[PDB]
Design a protein around this ligand. Structure first.
Ligand code: BDO
Length: 387
């Protein structure tokens, strides 16, 4: 591990997001910021909010610059654009001038108890609001310093419920800015092409549930796109793929019947402490386009990744979970519960995303997550969707 200063710099969990500490302004104002690979704006609470115990105060920053322009983002948050000096305490030892959307109004954006006060959109300018002229933070970072155009994320799910006090004292993972820390993964890194630079778009070419081919036209797996998004909790799948996957996961786990509410990701299921039947649930393998023609590799996750630990409505001693795979009308989204099984390298410089088994993924004595290759796969270009 060559990036000790950035190792263990994240806190949080899949359901509320993972955040890194940042400072904005002069003198520096400390804020917790959601790491989001699914958006492209650096936006921070800049006014009183019931769920914020701190916010960016522009009038207190001598380096604050007003852009005299508003920004509206309906998902919703509304803000005022400006620039100011930004640093990441547990990151590269550099300070950069970056765009900052000062959030003055929001609805269902700030999560009570998440402990984050802003969001760091790490994707490309193409999806930045109001438009692509608003340079994303990471672009500014790379243009203004010698930091390599690459970052890597190790998101660490605990494998169990973290109460309010625990989630604040627990290490939630690592965001390595400008490099790859070898202590964060085991085995080899396998790279899949970033199909296009907007979201971190990838192409899935095959899906297996316990080794059984879901057998769908691979274009279905990427309809209308597949992205890697730390800002989403669940593994989200295109409606038709979701229906086929749930049918297969139910069949694999058929020795136990679960209520429709469970499969809809709305209700928790509980087992007596320590008796969660991990073994009756299937592993899920996603094959991704490789860097070599006609070559693919696969990432395999366990139910320890797709069943999200949640506290029992009775706070009892049972181990309870929610099914963290859900339907999407906007394509496949490899959310936080999937990222928790792997060390994910966002190699912007080489337009590729790398995957390796995470040193912090949750597993049991019988099965582990995996990243394996190579596999001979034909016509993978046909798996991509074109509007
Ligand atoms: C982290 C959230 C609160 C804020 C935001 C913008 N970031 C994010 N990754 N998503 C999920 C998403 C991805 C792609 C399209 C849409 Cl519409 C939403 C969001 O809604």
């Amino acid at each position: 591990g060559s990036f000790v200063e950035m190792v263990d710099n994240l806190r949080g969990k899949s359901g509320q997001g993972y955040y890194v500490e940042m400072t904005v302004g002069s003198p520096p104002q400390t804020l917790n910021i959601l790491v989001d690979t699914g958006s492209s704006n650096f936006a921070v609470g800049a006014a009183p909010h019931p769920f914020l115990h701190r916010y960016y105060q522009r009038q207190l920053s001598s380096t604050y610059r007003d852009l005299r322009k508003g920004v509206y983002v309906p998902y919703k948050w509304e803000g005022e654009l400006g620039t100011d000096l930004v640093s990441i305490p547990h990151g590269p030892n550099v300070t950069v001038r970056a765009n900052i959307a000062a959030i003055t109004e929001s609805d269902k954006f700030f999560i009570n108890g998440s402990n984050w006060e802003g969001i760091l959109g790490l994707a490309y300018a193409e999806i930045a609001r109001p438009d692509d002229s608003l340079e994303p933070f990471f672009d500014s970072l790379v243009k203004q310093t010698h930091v390599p155009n690459l970052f890597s994320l190790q998101l660490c799910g605990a494998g169990f419920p973290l109460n309010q006090s625990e989630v604040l004292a627990s290490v939630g993972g690592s965001m390595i800015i400008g490099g790859i820390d070898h202590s964060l993964y085991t085995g080899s890194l396998w790279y899949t092409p970033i199909r296009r630079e907007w979201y971190y778009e990838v192409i899935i070419v095959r899906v297996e549930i316990n080794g059984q081919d879901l057998k769908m036209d691979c274009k279905e797996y990427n309809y209308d796109k597949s992205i890697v998004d730390s800002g989403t909790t669940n593994l989200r799948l295109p409606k038709k793929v979701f229906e086929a996957a749930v049918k297969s996961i139910k069949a694999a786990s058929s020795t136990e019947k679960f209520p429709d509410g469970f499969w809809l990701g709305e209700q928790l299921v509980c087992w007596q402490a320590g008796t969660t039947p991990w073994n009756i649930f299937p592993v899920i393998s996603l094959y991704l386009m490789g860097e070599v023609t006609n070559q693919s590799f696969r990432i395999t996750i366990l139910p320890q990744q797709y069943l999200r630990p949640v506290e029992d409505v009775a706070t009892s001693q049972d181990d309870c979970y929610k099914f963290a795979i859900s339907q999407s009308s906007t394509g496949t989204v490899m959310g936080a519960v999937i990222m928790e099984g792997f060390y994910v390298v966002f190699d912007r410089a080489r337009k590729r995303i790398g995957f390796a088994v995470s040193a912090c993924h949750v597993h049991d004595e019988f099965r582990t997550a995996a990243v394996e290759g190579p596999f001979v796969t034909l016509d993978m270009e046909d798996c991509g969707y074109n509007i």
